[PDB]
From Swiss-Prot:
Job of this protein: Scaffold subunit of various histone acetyltransferase (HAT) complexes, such as the MOZ/MORF and HBO1 complexes, that acts as a regulator of hematopoiesis. Plays a key role in HBO1 complex by directing KAT7/HBO1 specificity towards histone H3 'Lys-14' acetylation (H3K14ac), thereby promoting erythroid differentiation.
Cross-linked sites for Glycyl lysine isopeptide (Lys-Gly) (interchain with G-Cter in SUMO2): K41
Subunit structure: Component of some HBO1 complex composed of KAT7/HBO1, MEAF6, ING4 and BRD1/BRPF2. Component of the MOZ/MORF complex composed at least of ING5, KAT6A, KAT6B, MEAF6 and one of BRPF1, BRD1/BRPF2 and BRPF3. Interacts (via PHD-type zinc finger domain) with unmodified histone H3. Interacts (via PWWP domain) with dimethylated and trimethylated 'Lys-79' on histone H3.
Record field: transmembrane: none
Recorded name of the encoding gene: BRD1
Protein's recorded name: Bromodomain-containing protein 1
Subcellular location field: Nucleus; Chromosome
Parent-protein residues present: 555 to 674 of 1058
Length: 121
């Protein structure tokens, strides 16, 4: 149907906008602390601590399959990156501090992304 096509075009345009959002958030992580999944070879206990691991590469896979239907879903995954790190790592660590700075800087970007998603529809 044409209605199904139109819905698919909207998902594609959302995907474009989320791709640009993802780029902008990841630039706020120049250390690349959040680029890849925590390795279970190097942190064998991780899944005892963290139930839903997340990272920028995993988000990019989901994005490229058009797997985010709305901005809320994408924000949920970004918050997991931050929140997981702030739980596993102590306040005094470079990892925790990196997550705080990512959260603070990413807020700016997400605030305008929400406006854009509502504005364009």
């Amino acid at each position: 149907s044409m209605e199904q096509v139109a819905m698919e075009l909207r998902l594609t345009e959302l995907t474009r906008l989320l791709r640009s959002v993802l780029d902008q958030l990841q630039d706020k992580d120049p250390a690349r602390i959040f680029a890849q999944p925590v390795s279970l070879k190097e942190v064998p206990d991780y899944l005892d601590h963290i139930k839903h691991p997340m990272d920028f590469a995993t988000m990019r896979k989901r994005l490229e399959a058009q797997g985010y239907k709305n901005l809320h879903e994408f924000e949920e995954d970004f918050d997991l990156i931050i929140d997981n790190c702030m739980k596993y790592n102590a306040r005094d660590t470079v990892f925790y501090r990196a997550a705080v700075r990512l959260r603070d800087q990413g807020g700016v970007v997400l605030r305008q992304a929400r406006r854009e998603v509502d504005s364009i529809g």
